[PDB]
Amino acid sequence: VPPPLKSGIGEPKKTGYKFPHVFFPYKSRYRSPHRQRWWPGSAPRFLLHSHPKRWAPRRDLSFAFFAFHGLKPFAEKNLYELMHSLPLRGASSYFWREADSDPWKHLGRKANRLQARGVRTQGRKQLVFSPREIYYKRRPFHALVFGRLSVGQLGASPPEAVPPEPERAEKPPDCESKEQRKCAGVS
């Protein structure tokens, strides 16, 4: 059965609807554009169903309860959550996205799609983000971070690192790139 609908933190109480959509009794193949994404092999809607209201008994309440965001796994920690614990709010640092452990790329119903090449039978140039201005609306998962986006070349070391690039000035300080997953930096 599908999970019950819940409102995210920072939102007033709303009135639940009686039916999922207008064509509830009559039609069945019609699907709403704002349908929930809970089946394995998908991603949330960011700010629609990612952070639902959290409740627990009085006994379970504690300081550590509030720090759940900052202890999330690597596969679910966003940029906002990552920059919150870093020195200087992660200012004057570098960040990049590692698209190697996505939920849909390992698990899901459509996890065996046919690509243009076929199957994978076997130093990169990944983008680097330099946060300049940081503004937190709804901590620790919400912020308007403005930074300079540039390109950088990876190294030959075992881990993913950035040797002597960024080199080229791509665009002036703009909005963030992605909000799914991010890595650390040299700083």
Binding site: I9, G10, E11, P12, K13, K53, R54, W55, R58, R59, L61, S62, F63, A64, F66, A67, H69, G70, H84, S85, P87, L88, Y136, R138, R139, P140
Partner: protein, 341 residues
């Protein structure tokens, strides 16, 4: 029943009632801010005329003075956060830290230091953090002050302090371990205080370390043990090294604190004689053999023979170290060497 009935009833109702308030639409909720500024009838009117969400929650937190009510307060906190009505500030971080303490829950207090920066803007007050260190010492648990110190130090947000380094040292020497084991762990913290920005400890720092240094193994190895060592080189070498560190530190401290047969005591002005106590120690030898091994103090000890320094007719020291001598190192040391001889 004044402390039981009137206390639980008042707090229970306040949180319970508050919950119900949130159920109403946003039009009936409390304002975020106290009031509008002047920019928006005399200037004193308004400004502060309304009850804020934050103000109500913190007002009800003053009633707790037991462990049972501590849990209750947390309930209210969650409400604010979940509804987006909480503004982290200096004050917020200060009262929260203290609230746990007042409820006789030191365990919970420590957790805060490792979970504040994840959901809060400002750090706690420096005063509070220092006070918690003494809590553990009073209960008799010097082993719990090592993890709290490291987290503070590692954190960049919190400004480094020189005073903070004193507590750590003092607590390690009181651990219930062997003489060699307790001193070894203490030296690690000392060392750490010389690399990262070369911090300068207070003048009353090097004295403590030196006291036990030349007393626990040095003194012991020439009194009863050699009856007719494994780190003799390190003990002697570190003895002198400690002294050196003090000199450099003290000279640089005075410039920022208050913006100030051969002998050199003829034209040396009138320095403090307090420091000559430790430097007057005679170097016997590296080994047991004090006559066939080493060939390289009275004139130094002539400044104060009768335990009377040049204090009444000399200079004045600001924030000096212990004025007293070495009872366990001087009194029992010279007598033995003489009486027995």
């Amino acid at each position: 029943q004044a402390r039981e009935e009137q206390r639980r009833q008042a707090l229970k109702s306040f949180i319970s009632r508050l919950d119900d308030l949130f159920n109403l639409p946003h039009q009936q909720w409390l304002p975020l801010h106290s009031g509008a500024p002047l920019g928006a009838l005399s200037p004193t009117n308004g400004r502060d005329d309304a009850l804020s969400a934050q103000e109500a929650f913190l007002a009800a937190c003053r009633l707790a003075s037991t462990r049972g009510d501590f849990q209750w307060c947390l309930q209210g906190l969650n409400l604010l956060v979940n509804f987006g009505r909480l503004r982290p500030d200096w004050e917020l971080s200060d009262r929260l830290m203290a609230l746990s303490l007042h409820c006789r829950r030191p365990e919970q207090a420590e957790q805060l230091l490792s979970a504040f920066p994840h959901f809060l803007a400002c750090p706690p007050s420096p005063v509070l953090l220092f006070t918690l260190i003494d809590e553990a010492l009073a209960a008799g648990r010097p082993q719990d002050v090592r993890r709290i110190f490291a987290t503070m130090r590692e954190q960049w947000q919190l400004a480094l302090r020189p005073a903070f380094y004193v507590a750590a040292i003092r607590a390690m020497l009181l651990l219930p371990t062997s003489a060699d084991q307790s001193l070894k762990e203490a030296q690690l913290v000392a060392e750490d205080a010389a690399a990262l920005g070369v911090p300068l400890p207070p003048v009353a720092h090097q004295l403590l370390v030196e006291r036990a240094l030349t007393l626990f193994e040095e003194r012991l190895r020439q009194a009863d043990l050699p009856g007719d060592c494994y780190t003799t080189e390190e003990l002697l070498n570190l003895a002198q090294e400690s002294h050196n560190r003090l000199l450099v530190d003290q000279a640089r401290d005075a410039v920022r604190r208050h913006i100030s047969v051969s002998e050199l005591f003829l034209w040396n002005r009138a320095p403090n004689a307090h420091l000559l106590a430790q430097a007057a120690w005679l170097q016997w030898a590296a080994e047991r053999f004090a006559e066939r091994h080493n060939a390289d103090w009275i004139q130094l000890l002539q400044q104060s023979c009768s335990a009377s320094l040049q204090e009444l007719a000399g200079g004045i020291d600001r924030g000096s170290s212990l004025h007293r001598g070495l009872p366990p190192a001087l009194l029992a040391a010279l007598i033995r060497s003489s009486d027995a001889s």
